[PDB]
């Protein structure tokens, strides 16, 4: 946009608003992978166990 | 005189305003799946101008 | 294009006085430059197709 | 191979849309320059006789 | 080891892209200063036009006994076709400016494409890389040729 | 969400332009019109004087 | 009947634009930007004149 026309606009502040909360939630699904892939791999654990025992 | 120059600079921002519907209409009409949606270095930034409302 | 020219070449040679810049030439030179915008924009949609 | 095939189709669909929605204003464009041309060279005549 | 070095090479190319793609905007202003610039000249060409017609006319309207012609008339003239030219060549030259700024934006694009493409690139390997035997992120996946593409 | 508030924003922002060009359109137009019957005005007093010397 | 942009320069004083025609009529020209060409992928859409 030229010269003048440039604005400092509510729509600025809006997706800037947008893109801090996108990274936040970003952060926050791959602490939730962590989680499940932990509890994955204790219940192979056990399974392995199981099998032995019988 | 005076009246060819009061011309002159409204047709300038005439033409100034069209540029920026053009440009904001663009942006609307862009939706999600597109084909040169890219990432650009620090969109964060401000320009040089700096113009209040 | 080809017939607005060419009407447009011949005015030209008109003796001294009777020679004027009549609205005609307004609307011929209008309709020169807006047909050729025209013919860009349609070859433009031809690369497109 | 299920991934595979559901791509496929999508893309054929994807296709065959951007294929027609050129053609609706495609047509579109072609009358209404017809239109204005005929109507610019009606008013050059009438000036002129 | 190996993915180490490869993660460095990445890097490298990265810093260059983002380097040139910064002059490049920096140009792309310079540019569009200039042209805004021979806008408003052009805008001001046109005063003169207008006062020498008048000089012409006003020194027309004259009494029957005095009707002269000389280097006034005939300088005038040069000064009214001088104005017209230089009027064409401002609106070509300023034609073939629009037409840069074009091609400028287009290249600009298309770099900042591939620069973003490698920067998700790199992070994905980043986050790869952290990995250990130990580690959690560990499981059984079958072979596969997409693997091997 | 938070997208849908975005679209809406911008949709306002470029009502509010429309309108302020079709103001500006029609206030050209009258200067185009005042302009040329002032030029009529100032030819016709221009031979009002012409004449008098007669 | 016509329009005064015309009728401006239908006379003798100079007053007309260094240009051709009026612009309020016209549209996007005269030294316009961004001219959209829409990169072909095989994938996504191919939207022309996004002017929607």
Redesign the interface.
Same mark, same amino acid.
């Given at each position: 946009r /030229?010269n003048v026309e440039l604005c400092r606009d509510q729509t600025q502040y809006g997706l800037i608003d947008e893109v801090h909360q996108l990274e936040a939630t970003i952060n926050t699904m791959k602490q939730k992978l962590a989680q499940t892939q932990n509890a994955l791999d204790a219940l192979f654990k056990h399974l392995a166990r199981i099998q032995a025992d019988i | 005189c005076l009246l060819?120059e009061i011309?002159?600079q409204l047709?300038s921002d005439? +033409?100034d305003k069209?540029?920026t519907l053009?440009?904001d209409?663009?942006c609307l009409?862009?939706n999600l799946? /597109?084909?040169?949606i890219s990432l650009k270095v620090n969109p964060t930034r401000i320009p040089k101008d700096s113009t209040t409302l | 294009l080809k017939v607005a020219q060419t009407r447009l070449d011949e005015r030209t040679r008109r003796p001294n006085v009777e020679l004027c *810049?009549?609205?005609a030439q307004?609307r011929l030179?209008?309709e020169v430059?807006e047909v050729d915008?025209t013919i860009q924009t349609l070859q433009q949609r031809l690369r &497109?197709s | 191979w299920y991934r595979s095939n559901l791509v496929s189709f999508q893309?054929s669909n994807?296709?065959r849309?951007?294929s027609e *929605?050129?053609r609706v204003?495609t047509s579109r464009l072609i009358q209404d320059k017809y239109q204005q041309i005929r109507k610019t060279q009606a008013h050059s005549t009438q000036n002129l006789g | 080891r190996k993915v180490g070095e490869r993660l460095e090479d990445m890097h490298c190319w990265k810093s260059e892209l983002q380097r040139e793609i910064d002059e490049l905007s920096s140009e792309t202003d310079l540019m569009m200063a200039q042209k805004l610039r021979l806008?408003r000249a052009?805008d001001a060409?046109?005063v003169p036009?207008?006062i020498?017609? &008048?000089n012409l006319?006003c020194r027309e309207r004259r009494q029957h006994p005095d009707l002269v012609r000389d280097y006034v008339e005939v300088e005038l003239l040069k000064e009214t076709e001088l104005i017209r030219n230089i009027?064409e060549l401002? %609106?070509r030259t300023?034609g073939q400016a @629009?037409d840069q700024?074009?091609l400028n934006?287009?290249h600009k694009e298309s770099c900042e494409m591939n620069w973003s493409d490698k920067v998700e690139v790199y992070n994905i390997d980043d986050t790869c890389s952290r990995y250990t035997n130990e580690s959690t992120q560990v499981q059984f996946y079958p072979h596969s040729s997409k693997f091997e593409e | 969400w938070d997208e849908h508030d975005n679209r809406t924003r911008l949709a306002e922002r470029i009502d509010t332009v429309n309108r302020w060009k079709e103001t500006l359109?029609k206030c050209?137009?009258d200067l185009?019109?005042e302009? &040329?019957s002032l030029?009529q005005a %100032?030819?016709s007093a221009e031979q009002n004087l012409q004449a008098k010397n007669l | 009947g016509?329009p005064?942009?015309?009728?401006?320069?239908?006379?003798?004083?100079?007053?007309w634009?260094?240009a051709?025609?009026?612009?309020?009529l016209n549209?996007?020209?005269?030294?316009?930007?961004?001219?959209?060409?829409? +990169?072909?992928? +095989?994938? %996504?859409?191919?939207? @022309?004149? +996004?002017?929607?």
């Open positions: /030229s | 060819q011309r002159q047709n005439h +033409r069209m540029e053009e440009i209409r663009g009409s862009l799946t /597109s084909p040169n | *810049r009549d609205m307004l030179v209008n430059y915008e &497109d | 893309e994807s296709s849309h951007n *929605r050129l204003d | 806008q052009l060409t046109s036009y207008s020498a017609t &008048d006319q009027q401002l %609106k300023i @629009v700024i074009r934006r287009e | 359109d050209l137009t185009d019109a302009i &040329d030029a %100032k030819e | 016509l005064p942009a015309y009728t401006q320069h239908l006379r003798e004083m100079a007053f634009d260094p051709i025609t009026a612009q309020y549209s996007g020209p005269r030294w316009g930007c961004m001219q959209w060409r829409d +990169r072909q992928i +095989r994938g %996504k859409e191919f939207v @022309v004149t +996004r002017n929607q």
